[model samples]
Target: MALAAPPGELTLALTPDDKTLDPASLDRALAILAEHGILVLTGMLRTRLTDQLRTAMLDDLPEVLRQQDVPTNFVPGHVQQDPPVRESLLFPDVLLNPVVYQITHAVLGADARNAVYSGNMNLPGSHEQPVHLDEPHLWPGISHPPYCLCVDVPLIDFTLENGSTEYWPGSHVLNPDECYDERGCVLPAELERRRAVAPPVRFPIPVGSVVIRDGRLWHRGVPNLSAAPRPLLAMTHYTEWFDMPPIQLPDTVKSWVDGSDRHTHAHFVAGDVDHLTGDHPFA
Candidate 1:
């Protein structure tokens, strides 16, 4: 059988209608995802002040680095100590407002909570990360049925040359036994057997565009062959009950969390649920 086409290429605007969280919209979104295993929502989180916020956020980033003890020369893709990047990210609410959170909640089910806020600074010469799932580290035993969701918003335009993220359709449904959790690009023997089944697709969206994906979907950042660097702001969330792996947070991050509102601070918290699990339900 032939592989199916990915979801619509049009940019979906989040409007009052989007706020409805209707079954039809949800079903359609979920269906496209279930079939394709990935969906890109261009301009899903676009805001009028996006450019301004980007500029401001970049400016405030250094303070975060200082507070978090991250070296000024800290490069992208390197694992840094509990850096102020997390704290610096919270300064702008545009990316973390209620609407986006609500949408994530709806899609991730009622058990959803904020997972991580970090920057992916794909420098001009940086190599692409191997396509893989984001939740493999957290849920070692869980099979598909997606336990997490990610929203990737590009601070700059993501283009083919500039290294936009690439993904393989329908890879999310693969059993855990069939997937490889390492950082390399070699596909597992089982997945390789299906290579002729459906090759991966590279979907590039413009700046201010957002791609919402199932955490189990196979994806990786494309190499930045361009002169300029590619930067992406990623916000990931998961079902409230998911167990998080051991990742350190800086003391400054605590100050940032303390200063932030409940929702904002919730992003920094480990584990999934705080309380009130009964209030949220999923189909």
Candidate 2:
């Protein structure tokens, strides 16, 4: 059985003792995620670590913004920036999180591998993005289960005033052709049609929150009414059988994730990773 909470309330609070979810809790989480295409889990990171990540990412923001010939702004003031790939910054607590792996393994199978390690920042005065899918289905006429799952960890608390991402619940199961155009953008008319049936929602979760959602879910970044920038670290775990371009990771950080349940599909290069100007597989 699913939890007693409503669709938007599909959130689970984790205590420090939680190395992984209990069987019942895991089942409930899978149920909520399967039905709504999104789930929020709190207490995934320590408060101090979250703060440190925020500071370090902010320090790297200037260089990320200065990169040329790269597609940064998806919507005005919303920049697609890759997080710093430094050893100190890439902690296993966030990268090799067991709670995330348990859920990913259930959804994408035990052979799941992290494909993308990137992020997006909603700067002050950002406009809402057009509601769309990060990717469409492989088969146009046939419907299948999810092949990719996006894991997002917000360094700061997410609030309506600070621009939490808005998600359309259950939209992942909608027919691919009906939701996306030839250019892969969502049609304005379809957005209106879906709004009448079920409007989208935002998860105003706390600082240590982790959000997992289907890559095909309909979502968009809204305006950041606050003065400070809101940065959300993102990663996509794909089934091992899926063919994807590898992620670039420096050799210094190899030991952090050397032996883990979830495999990282990365190329361990010798030099410092130029995350800002480097080529992103699916950017």
Candidate 3:
């Protein structure tokens, strides 16, 4: 929750009980996100579930790493779709906190769907990512409202030592060329100049905390210098105006997906999902 001085200043931190998020606080949280493009929510998940997911993610990551291309094996123990393996963690509450949607609905719409469900496993010695944005502007040289959002729920404590995400708050509203990420990521050489103009902040989030951010925000994955893997679940929602197809979910969890109050409009599939194989889709 350490936010520096406007767009970053507007970064909000809230610790409301997930079951008791009030309208007043929700409105303020939404307002802050609309202004700053990032929000950190504490106590969003019960620690027991978070810990369980962490252990499960560790067990599942090796398979993903084994399946990756040898040269493309950027990190040894990285994986995606961490929730589907366990029937208990298959619902939206474990995947996407219910309260996070208040901001998504404000930025996108009530019908916005959770279009991406993936996970990150930053094992010890994971390398730092170059500065980048998840997606580019709809077109060059003009500004438009954000059409995508990424909400991150960490399975373990996040810190500089364990590769917490680095964020350049307030960069979303700026010109695309000023912070190019067209290759699905930006280069590290431009870090100094970009920071000289606009400072960036990294996350040292707590266990069970939820980090909501604009999909277009300038960010990167920092190196993990710790002993264990830093696992986190990533959920994405697209504005109703966009008709992007969402990742598939196992039919075993179809009842949970269909029954949850959470708004997830993804197409379901009948088999396994490997979320680590794709290029970034941020718009």
Give lDDT per model, in order.
Answer: 0.54, 0.82, 0.67
> Mind giving the per-residue lDDT tens digits that candidate 2 earns over 70-151?
4545667888888888777887878778899999999999989998988888899999888888877777656789998999
2 against 3, candidate with superior lDDT: 2
TM-score of 1: 0.68
Scored by TM-score, the top model is 2
Please give the distance, in angstroms, between residue 194's alpha carbon in candidate 1 and its true position after superposition: 3.3
| Per-model root-mean-square deviation over C-alphas | 8.8, 3.8, 4.9
For model 3, residues 158-271, the per-residue Cα lDDT tens digits are 876777777886777765454464475655555676678778876567787777878878777767888987888878888766776666555667777776656776555555
TM-score of 2: 0.91
Give TM per candidate.
0.68, 0.91, 0.82
Candidate 3, lDDT over the whole model: 0.67
Q: Score residue 209 of candidate 1 by CA lDDT.
A: 59
- Tens digits of per-residue lDDT for model 1 on 126-178? 65565566656344445547667777767776777777767777777765443
**Candidate 1, 148: how far from true, in Å?**
0.6
